[PDB]
Write a protein that binds this ligand. Structure first.
Ligand SMILES: OC[C@H]1O[C@@H](O[C@H]2[C@H](O)[C@@H](O)[C@H](O)O[C@@H]2CO)[C@H](O)[C@@H](O)[C@@H]1O
Ligand SMILES: OC[C@H]1O[C@@H](O[C@H]2[C@H](O)[C@@H](O)[C@H](O)O[C@@H]2CO)[C@H](O)[C@@H](O)[C@@H]1O
Ligand SMILES: [Ca+2]
Length: 627
């Protein structure tokens, strides 16, 4: 191994040293080593399907670089055992594909919840269910639930037992203004053992009566990442004559891909462009946007009296993955077993790439995405709204606190997958898209004289794209603005990765963009010079938002009372920390509390698992492509 592959092995070893504490005792990676953190998960020893995806990717690269596929197989084994709900977790009975769910609106503020079920709103047909049951002989949905309480910190345990590790939980339920700070963490398996008389159900959905039930929520970007990772694992293992070793792992990915088509459908299977909650439901694929939406979700009564499935009407460019889509569409090893799996993915591949191109700003950054459900209630679009196969442009799909596309990290994460795609296929549209985004990137990244660097941290947006008609117009009235800069190391690494794939691609298919490679190499080297530490790499970051631990009110309706597993009482007026009193026993709590009582912005040096993974993988990627 060269210099870069050595950097990978160094960080890999830091990640896998059990004294460093990246993984729990079951081998499940945590969101971060440090427990005091709040940003998407609200505690650092939760974990995410995202973390698991990065774990698979990390070990794929380990296989490439060492010839040893045991790390990859173990990563998948743990993913499947713990993060995919098992048969007993998702006992689905009495599903009706002609009636997939009952509609409820999305609402602008958390105080509008619980959202009423509206029983007359028509819901469309689910065209996947029968095919998948016929294909696999099961109602089991093979996809990751997004959020896990790894060491049962919240107390829900496994299927209501209050004690087991790897406890499925959820948070976000109450629309676009429910920040990470404004949620009520609740179990996926609802037995009424906590919360109120109806457990947590009646904070979120208003119904005439309530039953015990389960539900899970997929994060399609993560599942798609895990597929992307697996594609490279099988390419890299075939190069070594080790295909059969990972053969069964490639099949898991192909199956994950098959179920991940639920992410391609409107929430309530309503036709694209309907702009009316009272319109008739779709009859098949007229409700497919063929994008990786923000989620799919599924549920069932513990009875077996009913079950349900939803997609999502909102798509963010940040979620898309042309590399996974291409693999499922075109690579015979990754072909899903269903009749329509691969064809559906080929449609999604092309729709995705058009989506990215439609959202490309005048400068080259990618704008947020689009919705088939304006305001989350199938409203009529404002006059003058730009559209994409009948979906309305949104600058900040799904969330507004903060705006989902104010985070520059989507640029890197998502464009990295397009750069891999372009590297493999030479697709001209993907190349033209990349060339303009790379041009923007070079103009915004700061390489300081003193050897430091900064990348955009927050973005803001103005205007709209032109309505899509199959070709890119330049979007001269759509603008990005860089609001501030930072040293997010996971994102920096991800951007270097994107730039490396793109550069390698231009060498194969056109004029070698050597500057792109050099910028990538500068970022990776300056980072390595500056930010190594005992557990991997970190850079200081200020978290002024952490005032919200103490100050953020969590909406609870007047008159509703319940309890968390540790006895914390849930009622009107409670703050973030009031329903998470165990935070006060965190090792860093005294530090934060003193910083807060004292008027000062706390500062942290985090080891996020995904970031350490992105770092390792980007350094390895230099070796694989250019060494
Ligand atoms: O939700 C997207 C993404 O966010 C990650 O946290 C960000 C946070 O959103 C941003 O405001 C902060 O400044 O930087 C961190 C780290 O990049 C979170 O780590 C991811 O899990 C999540 O997918
Ligand atoms: O439509 C099947 C079934 O749905 C039940 O409501 C579900 C709804 O479909 C789901 O999307 C929502 O988020 O969760 C609730 C369950 O709390 C409904 O109560 C049943 O009567 C209906 O048969
Ligand atoms: Ca809010």
């Amino acid at each position: 191994l060269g210099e870069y592959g050595q950097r990978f092995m160094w960080l890999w070893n830091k990640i896998h040293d059990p004294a460093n504490g990246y993984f729990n005792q079951d081998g499940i990676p945590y969101h971060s080593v440090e427990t005091l953190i709040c940003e998407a998960p609200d505690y650092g020893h939760l974990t995410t399907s995202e973390a698991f995806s990065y774990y698979v990717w990390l070990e794929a690269v380990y296989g490439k670089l060492t010839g040893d596929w045991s790390k990859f197989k173990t990563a998948w084994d743990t993913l499947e055992k713990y993060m995919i709900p098992s048969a007993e977790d998702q006992p689905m009975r009495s599903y009706d594909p002609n009636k997939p769910a009952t509609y409820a609106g999305e609402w602008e503020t958390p105080d509008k919840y619980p959202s009423p079920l509206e029983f007359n709103v028509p819901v469309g047909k689910d065209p996947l269910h029968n095919e998948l049951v016929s294909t696999y002989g099961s109602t089991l949905m093979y996809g990751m639930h997004w959020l896990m309480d790894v060491d049962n910190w919240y107390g829900y345990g496994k299927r209501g037992d209050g004690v087991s590790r790897a406890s499925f939980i959820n948070t976000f339920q109450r629309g676009p203004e429910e920040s990470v700070w404004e949620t009520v963490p609740h179990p996926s398996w609802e037995e009424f053992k906590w919360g109120g008389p109806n457990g947590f159900l009646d904070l979120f959905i208003k119904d005439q009566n309530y039953s015990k039930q389960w539900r899970y929520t997929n994060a399609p970007d993560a599942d798609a990442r895990a597929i992307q990772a697996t594609y490279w694992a099988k390419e890299w293992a075939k190069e070594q004559g080790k295909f059969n070793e990972i053969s069964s792992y490639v099949a898991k990915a192909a199956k994950m891909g098959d179920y991940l088509r639920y992410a391609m459908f409107d929430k309530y299977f309503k036709p694209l462009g309907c702009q009316d909650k009272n319109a008739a439901g779709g009859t098949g694929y007229d409700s497919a946007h063929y994008l990786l939406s923000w989620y799919y979700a599924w549920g069932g009564a513990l009875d077996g009296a009913w079950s349900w499935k939803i997609g999502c009407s909102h798509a963010h460019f940040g979620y898309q993955n042309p590399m996974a889509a291409w693999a499922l569409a075109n690579d015979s090893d990754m072909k899903p077993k269903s009749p329509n799996g691969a064809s559906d993915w080929a449609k999604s591949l092309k729709r995705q790439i058009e989506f990215y191109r439609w959202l490309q700003s005048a400068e080259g950054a990618i704008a947020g995405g689009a919705t088939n459900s304006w305001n989350g209630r199938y409203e009529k679009y404002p006059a003058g709204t730009a559209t994409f196969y009948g979906m309305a442009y949104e600058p900040n799909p799904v969330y507004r606190d903060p705006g989902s596309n104010t985070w520059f990290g989507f640029q890197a994460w998502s464009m990295q997958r397009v750069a891999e795609y372009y590297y493999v296929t030479g697709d001209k549209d993907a190349g033209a898209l990349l060339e303009k985004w790379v041009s923007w990137i070079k103009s915004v990244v700061k390489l300081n004289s003193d050897g430091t660097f900064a990348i955009p941290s927050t973005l803001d947006w103005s205007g709209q794209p032109d309505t899509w008609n199959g070709t890119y117009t330049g979007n001269p009235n759509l603008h990005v603005k860089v609001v501030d800069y930072g040293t997010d190391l996971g994102i920096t690494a991800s951007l270097a990765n994107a730039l490396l794939y793109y550069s390698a691609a231009t060498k194969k298919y056109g004029v070698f963009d050597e500057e792109a490679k050099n910028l990538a190499k500068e970022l990776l080297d300056r980072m390595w010079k500056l930010y190594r530490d005992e557990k991997g790499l970190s850079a200081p970051e200020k978290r002024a938002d952490y005032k919200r631990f103490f100050e953020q009110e969590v909406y609870i309706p007047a008159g509703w009372t319940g309890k968390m597993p540790n006895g914390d009482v849930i009622k009107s007026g409670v703050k973030f920390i009031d329903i998470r009193s165990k935070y006060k026993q965190d090792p860093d709590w005294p530090k934060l509390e003193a910083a807060y009582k004292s008027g000062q912005v706390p500062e942290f040096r985090y080891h996020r698992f995904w970031a350490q993974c992105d770092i390792a993988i980007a350094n390895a990627t230099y070796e694989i492509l250019f060494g």
